[PDB]
Symmetry: C3
Subunit: 112 residues, 3 copies
């Protein structure tokens, strides 16, 4: 009777020893595979990327090279404009002298 | 006496059985709720976003459509410039012929 | 004999009590340090940043201020162009009247 209880206890303690050993095995496997709070500290949050620009946001982005190409076109038009200005100035001068010459001729010819 | 110790052991083993059972329950709950190393492998790090562009970085971005609109303005100025060039050429020609006509008249009139 | 087994069981149960206590300590430390599924839900994934624009992507970005500066250059060329147009118009008029005056003089002078 007492002896039965002791036998029962021997069996139950051996089974507990094994249950404890298996829990240790499991906890070990868990620790090797667990992400930690430190791990989380190295990670980007959703909030960290809430103001992220995407490749689609910039798909139509102009570049500094686009600006430089336009600036070249503008400088070349400025040079052409100056060249025309100079020719107009030469002509303005020639027209003024022609007007003077014609005035003199009209004085000299009168009614003919 | 022996019997007391056996009773003590019976109680202590039943309590251990329950403690072990509760630990199993807890470990189960932990495994269902644990983030894993594989989970971490799918996540973005802080380092991964260190060179991220933001929506504020691009708030003043020019576009390809801004460049196209300027280019249209530049092409239209080029056409206007050519039109003026052509009219200046016509005038240069007319001034040259007037100069010739006036020269001939001055020869024919002399001092009047 | 029975007494030996009981002594053995007493020792083994005390050691189990301590093993269980140490497992509880460990599990506690694990729970305090574990990242959770909720934690993972707050984190950015690699997939979330797959379309991220970088600071290098925008290193050559033109700005709205670059566009405004070109537009000023273009407006100023437009004004210069108009000014030249007006002077050409004045000259066209003067050339037309000179042509008329010279025609009249040629009629009046004839062969001289």
């Amino acid at each position: 009777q007492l002896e039965m209880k002791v036998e029962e206890l021997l069996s139950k303690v051996y089974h507990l020893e094994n249950e404890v050993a298996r829990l240790k095995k499991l906890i070990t496997l868990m620790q090797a595979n667990m992400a930690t709070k430190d791990d989380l500290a190295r990670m980007a949050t959703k909030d960290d990327i809430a103001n992220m620009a995407t490749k689609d946001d910039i798909a139509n982005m102009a570049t500094k090279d686009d600006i430089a190409k336009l600036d070249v076109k503008i400088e070349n038009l400025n040079t052409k404009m100056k060249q025309l200005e100079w020719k107009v100035e030469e002509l303005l001068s020639k027209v003024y002298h022609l007007e003077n010459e014609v005035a003199r001729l009209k004085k000299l010819v009168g009614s003919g």
